[PDB]
Amino acid sequence: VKKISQYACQRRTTLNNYNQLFTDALDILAENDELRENEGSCLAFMRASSVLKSLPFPITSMKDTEGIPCLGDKVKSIIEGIIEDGESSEAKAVLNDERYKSFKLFTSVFGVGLKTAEKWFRMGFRTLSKIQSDKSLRFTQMQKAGFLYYEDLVSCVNRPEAEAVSMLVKEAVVTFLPDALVTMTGGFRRGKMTGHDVDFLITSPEATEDEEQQLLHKVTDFWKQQGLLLYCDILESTFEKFKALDHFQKCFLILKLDHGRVHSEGKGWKAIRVDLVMCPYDRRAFALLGWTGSRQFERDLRRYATHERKMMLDNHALYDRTKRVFLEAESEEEIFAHLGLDYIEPWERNA
DNA sequence: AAAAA
DNA sequence: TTTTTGA
DNA sequence: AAAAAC
Ligand SMILES: Nc1ccn([C@H]2CC[C@@H](COP(=O)(O)OP(=O)(O)OP(=O)(O)O)O2)c(=O)n1
Ligand SMILES: [Mg+2]
Ligand SMILES: [Mg+2]
Ligand code: NA
């Protein structure tokens, strides 16, 4: 029998999850450990959830868990409890916990992460209305946008919306850089029907250093002139060819997506979170691999490179510590081949 | 929390 | 037992 | 001067 690897980068994980009863519970337990800053226990529940997502059959008895890695005693007790009556008492207790409920609610606001959510909870806040109306609190520009466009941003992006955004991004980019290669990355590249945002990788084989640097500024100025730019933060590249977010130039946006552009009213438009990444042409395969995800697939790719191959992988490069050389790649397939891994298709990276 | 060193 | 867990 | 954004 074929042995399931402990690494997500050695598993094929499509969106057809036969174990959602177990993985929904494990994702909740992981999220609680993330909040309680218990990184180790968090990661163990994330890995167990990931491996169950790869299974081609549903777990219906404890015998079905034999030989599956990342399922220790604690995880097997959770699976046993769900087999017993269809529910997880552990995940149910987390769903009813006040700290957990407040963290989920507060971090659902764009611009609010773990530190600000924890701060507001310890101050005694429990609702978004009481936070917004408070006269002592001061909000960042990101949080102001997060509250103003809250319902649109919490409703998530569907495929017709992602496709409409892709058309807008591609059309704007090729207007200013005709030879640019625009790729939608993230969940939508992995075949997802929904996402919290729409991510893109932009690269150009012939653009100069100045042209490459100016593209995101030209495209966002163009949208600003049209009143489509609801939020914009451009992070300049800190990329160093000879060697936390990656160092490529990027922008975190909120775009006004007119309903007439969506082929699938109210105010007639929807606020959409969009991320654009510009990378030098020679790093395009590393950037594409890093931005395609999933987060668990990326973690395990890097963990496999370190522990199994004595290599160092990131969104910009692959370094071989034994040969003392950087390994170049023109495609994701070439990165997988450098690592000694069978190629995993993007729609198989939903770890 | 699980697996490796 | 202690170390590692993605950059 | 942290925090947030992946
Ligand atoms: N902690 C993280 C977060 C993100 N990423 C990478 C892989 C995914 C990519 C996009 O980030 P998200 O937009 O948050 O990921 P997603 O897969 O697109 O999921 P969603 O469908 O919710 O946008 O960046 C990662 O490696 N590690
Ligand atoms: Mg995304
Ligand atoms: Mg993103
Ligand atoms: Na948030």
Chain B nucleotides reached by a protein CB under 7 Å: 1-5
**A57 in the Ramachandran plot: left (φ > 0), alpha (ψ -120 to 50) or beta?**
beta
Residue A197 known to be catalytic:
yes
Which tokens is A49 given?
């959830």
Nearest-CA neighbor of A271 among A303, A226, A230?
Answer: A230
Separation between Cα atoms, residue A172 and residue A179, nearest integer Å: 12
Separation between Cα atoms, residue A218 and residue A230, nearest integer Å: 16
State the closest ligand 1 atom to the C-alpha of A199, by its place in the atom list counted from 1. 13
SS3 A82: helix
Tell me the DSSP string of A147-182.
HHTHHHHHT-EEHHHHHHHHHHHHHHHHHH-TT-EE
Q: Cβ of A232: how many Cβ atoms within 10 Å?
A: 19
CA angle (A251 as vertex; A248, A256 as ends), nearest 5: 155
Give the pairing type, strands A325-326 and A311-313. Answer: unpaired
Taking each helix axis as running N to C, give the angle between helix A159-176 and helix A209-225, from 0 to 180 degrees, rounded to the nearest 10: 120
Separation between Cα atoms, residue A100 and residue A107, nearest integer Å: 11
Q: Which strand (E) or helix (H) includes residue A39? A: helix A39-54
User: Does A90 contact ligand 1 (Cβ within 6 A)?
Assistant: no
A307 is in an annotated binding site: no
What letter does residue A62 receive in the DSSP assignment?
G
**A86 in the Ramachandran plot: left (φ > 0), alpha (ψ -120 to 50) or beta?**
left
Q: Cβ of A264: how many Cβ atoms within 10 Å?
A: 9
A325 is in an annotated binding site: no
Domains of chain A plus CATH, in order, are 1-96 (1.10.150.110), 97-155 (1.10.150.20), 156-281 (3.30.460.10), 282-350 (3.30.210.10)
Q: In what order do the strands lie in the sheet with A318-320?
A: A311-313, A318-320, A325-326
Contact between A273 and A198 (Cβ < 8 Å): yes
Rg (CA), chain A: 22
Which tokens is A339 given?
């690592």
A227 is in an annotated binding site: no
Q: CB pairs under 8 A, 24+ apart, for A145-153?
A: A145/A110, A145/A111, A145/A230, A145/A231, A145/A254, A146/A109, A146/A110, A146/A111, A146/A112, A147/A109, A149/A110, A149/A230, A149/A231, A149/A254, A149/A271, A150/A109, A152/A270, A152/A271, A152/A272, A153/A110, A153/A196, A153/A254, A153/A271, A153/A273
State the closest ligand 1 atom to the C-alpha of A186, by its place in the atom list counted from 1. 18
Strand partners of residue A232: A253
Q: Which residues sit with Cβ closer than 5 angstroms to ligand 3, an ion? A: A 197, 199, 275
SS3 A99: helix
Separation between Cα atoms, residue A139 and residue A132, nearest integer Å: 9
Separation between Cα atoms, residue A279 and residue A237, nearest integer Å: 9
Judge if the upstream peptide bond of residue A166 is cis by omega within 30 degrees of 0. no
Residue A199 known to be catalytic:
yes
User: Does A152 contact ligand 1 (Cβ within 6 A)?
Assistant: no
Which tokens is A336 given?
């997988």
Give the pairing type, strands A181-184 and A194-195. Answer: unpaired
Q: Whose CA is nearest to atom 18 of ligand 1?
A: A186
Contact between A279 and A205 (Cβ < 8 Å): no
* Ligand 3 mean position, distance from CA A250 (Å): 10
| Chain mean position to CA A330 | 23
State the closest ligand 1 atom to the C-alpha of A275, by its place in the atom list counted from 1. 13
* Ligand 2 mean position, distance from CA A185 (Å): 7
Sign of CA dihedral A174, A176, A181, A184: negative
Separation between Cα atoms, residue A334 and residue A43, nearest integer Å: 29
Which tokens is A197 given?
């945002």
Contact between A97 and A33 (Cβ < 8 Å): no
SS3 A244: coil
Q: CB pairs under 8 A, 24+ apart, for A186-191?
A: A186/A275, A186/A291, A186/A292, A186/A293, A187/A293, A187/A294, A188/A159, A188/A162, A189/A292, A189/A346, A190/A15, A190/A292, A190/A293, A190/A294, A190/A346, A190/A347, A190/A349, A190/A350, A191/A14, A191/A15, A191/A346, A191/A347, A191/A350
Question: Does the CB of A45 fall within 7 Å of any strand B atom?
Answer: yes
- The whole-number Å distance from A36's CA to C5's C1' is 17
Q: Cβ of A347: how many Cβ atoms within 10 Å?
A: 14
Amino acid present at A194: T
Burial class (CB in 10 A: 0-12, 13-18, 19+), A158: middle
Separation between Cα atoms, residue A71 and residue A74, nearest integer Å: 8
Separation between Cα atoms, residue A316 and residue A323, nearest integer Å: 19
Q: Cβ of A179: how many Cβ atoms within 10 Å?
A: 12
User: Does A159 contact ligand 1 (Cβ within 6 A)?
Assistant: no
SS3 A41: helix
- Name, in order, each residue with C-beta under 8 angstroms of A67's C-beta and a sequence gap of 6 or more: A1, A3, A4
Which one from A199, A246, A300, A314 is the annotated catalytic residue?
A199
Deposited resolution, Å: 2.0
Q: What are phi and psi of A63, to 5 degrees?
A: -60, -35
Separation between Cα atoms, residue A280 and residue A282, nearest integer Å: 6
SS3 A320: strand
User: Does A197 contact ligand 1 (Cβ within 6 A)?
Assistant: yes
- Please tell me chain A's helix, strand, coil percentages from 3-state DSSP, rounded to the nearest 5: 50, 15, 35
